[PDB]
Amino acid sequence: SSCNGPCRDLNDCDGQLICIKGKCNDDPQVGTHICRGTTPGCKPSGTLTCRGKSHPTYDCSPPVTSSTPAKLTNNDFSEGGDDGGPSECDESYHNNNERIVALSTGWYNGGSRCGKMIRITASNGKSVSAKVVDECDSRHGCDKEHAGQPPCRNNIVDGSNAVWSALGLDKNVGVVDITWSMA
């Protein structure tokens, strides 16, 4: 491996080249600028402040698998509600008797899962199928336009009343652990 190229755990690679990240960048004390100009963990992109708190922001979410761990929260998708306007996938409002969810920005993946069903499993072993209709935005929040609410976390399935009920869960606990997959 040279410049845009990967070392193992340690710097088992070409020339007098060391390991920065998982790539063979240059050694600073050597003074050689061989890999100059070349470039290469879901982590927070930064923070937004509201109230007092700093809240992390994210562009990404953990990897989607056949059994993806997540936190389930509760959201009002109706025209009456909390959200800033219509759901992203279809520019409409929905009833909270519909089995529907929003997904953290990374899982939302620019709309690639809109209109798809996911299967959510709770800790009591109940499962429910729900349609993806919206993004739980983990990049933006804490302002006029979002009602001063923090940005979403990165591992969130934000479910309707009907999703919580189908799962036998009390929405007043606010947040519970689940797993999910495409259905």
UniProtKB/Swiss-Prot annotation:
A cellular component term, taken from the record's GO annotations: extracellular region
SUPFAM superfamilies in the record: Barwin-like endoglucanases (SSF50685)
Disulfide bond keyword on record: yes
InterPro entries associated with the record: Kiwellin-like (IPR039271), RlpA-like_sf (IPR036908)
Matches recorded under Gene3D superfamilies: RlpA-like domain (2.40.40.10)
Subcellular location(s) per record: Secreted
Record protein name field: Kiwellin
Coiled coil (UniProt feature): none
Sequence ranges of Polar residues compositional bias: 63-77
Residues found modified as 4-hydroxyproline: P40
Transmembrane segments: none
Keyword tags: Allergen, Disulfide bond, Hydroxylation, Secreted, Signal
Primary site of residence: secreted
Listed CDD domains: DPBB_kiwellin-like
Cysteine pairs bridged by disulfides in the record: C3-C35, C7-C19, C13-C24, C42-C60, C50-C142, C89-C114, C136-C142
Post-translational modification: Undergoes proteolytic cleavage by actinidin to produce kissper and KiTH. Three forms of KiTH are produced by cleavage at different sites, the main form produced in vivo is KiTH-1.
Location of region: Disordered: 61-91
Family, per entry: Belongs to the kiwellin family.
